[PDB]
Amino acid sequence: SQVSEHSIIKDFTPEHAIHKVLQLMLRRGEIQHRMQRKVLYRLK
Amino acid sequence: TVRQLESMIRLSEAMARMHCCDEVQPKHVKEAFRLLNKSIIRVETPEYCRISNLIVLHLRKVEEEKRSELVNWYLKEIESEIDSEEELINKKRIIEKVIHRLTHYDHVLIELT
């Protein structure tokens, strides 16, 4: 979940950047990154 | 395509014109269709029934809109009609093929049947 994307923010110890990098990865390709969003997003 | 339809019309007209007819009867159309269909060749690739499996199961996964439950839900859903203890290994083998040639991430987004 995106809350997990924030948990990985906390344990590493910014929202805009963490969302932007994943957003770029989303158009980068198919494997391991489309598959986490292609179903979570549709199921919200 | 539709060009095949116009080819069929031309061929039926020629078939009629061969018999010196003033109008095309359905026997001419039947011969034109038979010739046109016979000319077109099936493309043979080396078993090829597996595409039947892929289409029938991709359709179900489409209808439903993890691996653990879903894999054996597949390995029951297509077994609902014909008895065999021997086509299960076949279905799991083709499922592995499909996994490892990147047609299943459990039904990848970009794949048209």
Chain B residue nearest residue A31, CA to CA: B105
Chain B residue nearest residue A29, CA to CA: B110
Q: Which residues contact A9 (CB under 8 A, 6 or more apart)?
A: A15, A18
* A30 min Cα distance to partner chain B (Å): 9
Alpha-carbon span B72 to A20, nearest angstrom? 37
Looking at chain A, which runs of residues are DSSP E strands?
none
Closest residue by Cα to residue A15 from A24, A6, A4: A6
Alpha-carbon span B26 to B16, nearest angstrom? 10
Residues of B in contact with A38 (CB under 8 A): 109
Q: Which residues contact A38 (CB under 8 A, 6 or more apart)?
A: B109
8 Å CB contact between B15 and B32: yes
Alpha-carbon span A18 to A11, nearest angstrom? 14
Alpha-carbon span B4 to A43, nearest angstrom? 45
Q: Please count the other Cβ atoms lying within 10 Å of the Cβ belonging to residue B29.
A: 17
Q: Is B50 annotated as a binding residue?
A: no
Method: cryo-EM
- The structure was resolved to a resolution in Å of 2.6
Alpha-carbon span B70 to B60, nearest angstrom? 12
Helix pair angle (B87-100, B50-63), 10° resolution:
70
